[PDB]
Design an enzyme around this catalytic site. Structure first.
Site, short mmCIF file in Angstrom:
data_model
loop_
_atom_site.label_atom_id
_atom_site.label_comp_id
_atom_site.label_asym_id
_atom_site.label_seq_id
_atom_site.Cartn_x
_atom_site.Cartn_y
_atom_site.Cartn_z
N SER A 19 66.17 58.03 28.08
CA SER A 19 67.07 58.12 28.90
C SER A 19 67.61 59.66 28.92
O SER A 19 68.88 59.90 29.41
CB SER A 19 68.09 57.22 28.92
OG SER A 19 69.30 57.91 28.20
N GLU A 20 66.82 60.54 28.42
CA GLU A 20 66.54 61.92 28.85
C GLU A 20 66.15 61.64 30.39
O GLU A 20 66.84 62.21 31.31
CB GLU A 20 65.24 62.38 28.33
CG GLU A 20 64.90 63.90 28.06
CD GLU A 20 63.93 64.10 27.15
OE1 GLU A 20 63.88 64.75 25.95
OE2 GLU A 20 62.86 63.20 26.99
N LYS B 259 42.33 37.43 39.04
CA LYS B 259 42.91 37.37 40.15
C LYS B 259 44.65 37.18 39.56
O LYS B 259 44.80 36.06 39.34
CB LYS B 259 42.84 36.12 41.05
CG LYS B 259 43.34 35.94 42.33
CD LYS B 259 42.10 34.71 43.08
CE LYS B 259 42.81 34.35 44.46
NZ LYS B 259 43.90 33.66 44.54
N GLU C 75 36.51 40.02 38.34
CA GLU C 75 38.01 40.62 38.35
C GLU C 75 38.77 39.40 38.04
O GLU C 75 38.72 38.39 38.52
CB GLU C 75 38.39 41.08 39.35
CG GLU C 75 37.72 42.49 40.07
CD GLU C 75 38.83 42.76 41.34
OE1 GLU C 75 38.56 42.14 42.22
OE2 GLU C 75 39.43 43.68 40.98
N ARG D 218 51.34 41.25 51.80
CA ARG D 218 50.08 40.95 52.60
C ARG D 218 50.48 39.96 53.51
O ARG D 218 49.71 40.00 54.71
CB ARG D 218 49.37 40.06 51.38
CG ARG D 218 48.26 39.19 52.06
CD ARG D 218 47.29 38.65 50.84
NE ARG D 218 46.03 38.13 51.54
CZ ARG D 218 45.60 37.20 52.22
NH1 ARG D 218 46.75 36.42 52.27
NH2 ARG D 218 44.63 37.01 52.43
N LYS E 267 32.69 39.71 43.61
CA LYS E 267 32.18 40.34 44.64
C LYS E 267 30.94 40.84 44.19
O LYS E 267 30.48 41.45 43.29
CB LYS E 267 33.05 41.49 45.19
CG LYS E 267 34.37 41.19 45.50
CD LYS E 267 35.58 42.66 45.82
CE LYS E 267 36.77 42.07 46.36
NZ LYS E 267 37.79 43.07 46.50
N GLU F 150 48.46 43.78 43.68
CA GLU F 150 49.30 42.76 43.42
C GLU F 150 50.53 43.11 42.69
O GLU F 150 50.20 44.05 41.55
CB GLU F 150 48.60 41.86 42.30
CG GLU F 150 47.45 41.03 43.25
CD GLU F 150 47.71 39.86 43.74
OE1 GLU F 150 49.09 39.44 43.73
OE2 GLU F 150 46.69 39.18 44.04
N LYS G 186 38.82 29.30 41.31
CA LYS G 186 40.08 28.69 41.11
C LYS G 186 40.04 27.80 39.79
O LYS G 186 39.30 27.08 39.63
CB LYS G 186 40.57 27.92 42.22
CG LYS G 186 41.04 28.50 43.33
CD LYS G 186 42.15 29.78 42.89
CE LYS G 186 42.50 30.62 44.02
NZ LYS G 186 43.94 31.35 43.36
#
Length: 297
Positions: free
Chosen positions: A22-23, A101, A99, A122, A272, A156, A296
């Site tokens: 907290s400089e 999610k 990747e 979004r 993808k 996200e 999923k």
């Protein structure tokens, strides 16, 4: 010598942002007071916005420049083999980017000449709500990119599980309604009308794509994610480029068992087609890309 000191203070503050998140406190308060006596020294990317501000975000409804993607789902190995067979029959051999999610608040961040100027949820994918002032309080979002691009980057926002639990601890003590999960704790902290309250919550972001690759040198999704890192953004390095659908399945196997183990929650894996020309080649059906799919758990 305010010019030198403001430049110095920006460098010191932006380095805190690129570091941990907290400089710091005293530095931030010094720049704030400079900007109050000299409002002309406040640039569009001033780090004093990290503290939140007097302006309440609008939650005006705004269309994204480009609608965000609406992904089909896969639920099993068979769903994925069909996905990959459709691809291979149409355009032949492809590599995949895999990747995690992230379970958070999906947002799109609009950059004009490399400055961060609008952040929307979004929403329904076409229209989101404007929480720009709230998102500016996230250190992991750069206020100015390293090249002066005009793009919307998609991410996200999330709260680490450990800070979600500390927040519920304070609700538990006030016997208020608890957040059901870290996702709701992020969305809730980012939809505060006072961005000073948002500033005090522990939030970060992973960037996963952009609306338009025109100005990127990248030729593939994996390369574009490296380019996003270089431009100043925070991306998730659990991503992996794999050669084929056997490689996808093996990435899913590994991550499935590990889905509770990271500092943030995840709700599946996005796969993808890697090469960007090949994405363009595969096209869309029923308004959803034929070259991407969300598995999923």
């Amino acid at each position: 010598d305010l010019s030198s000191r403001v430049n110095e203070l920006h460098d010191l503050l932006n380095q805190y942002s690129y570091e941990y998140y907290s400089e710091y406190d005293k530095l931030l308060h010094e720049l704030i007071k400079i900007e109050e006596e000299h409002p002309e020294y406040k640039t569009v990317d001033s780090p004093t916005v990290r503290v939140g501000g007097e302006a309440q975000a609008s939650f005006n409804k705004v269309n994204h420049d480009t609608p965000m993607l609406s992904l089909g789902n896969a639920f099993n190995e068979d769903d994925l083999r069909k996905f990959d067979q459709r691809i291979r029959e149409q355009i032949g051999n492809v590599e995949y980017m895999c990747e995690l999610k992230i379970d958070g608040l999906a947002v799109s961040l609009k950059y004009v000449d490399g400055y961060f100027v609008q952040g929307l949820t979004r929403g329904d994918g076409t229209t989101g709500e404007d929480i720009t002032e709230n998102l500016k309080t996230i250190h992991a979002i750069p206020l100015k990119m390293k090249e002066p691009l005009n793009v919307e980057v998609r991410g996200e926002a999330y709260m680490p599980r450990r800070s979600f639990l500390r927040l519920n601890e304070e609700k538990e003590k006030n016997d208020e309604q608890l957040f059901a999960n870290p996702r709701n704790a992020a969305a809730g902290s980012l939809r505060q009308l006072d961005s000073k309250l948002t500033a005090k919550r522990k939030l970060s972001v992973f960037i996963y794509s952009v609306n338009d690759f025109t100005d990127f040198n990248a030729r593939s999704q994996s390369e574009a994610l490296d380019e996003l890192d270089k431009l100043g953004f925070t991306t998730n390095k659990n991503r992996a480029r794999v050669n084929n659908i056997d490689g996808v399945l093996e990435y899913i196997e590994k991550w499935t068992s590990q889905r509770e183990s990271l500092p943030y929650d995840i709700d599946g894996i996005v796969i993808k087609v890697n090469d960007l020309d090949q994405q363009d080649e595969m096209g869309f059906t029923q308004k959803s890309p034929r070259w991407a799919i969300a598995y999923k758990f």
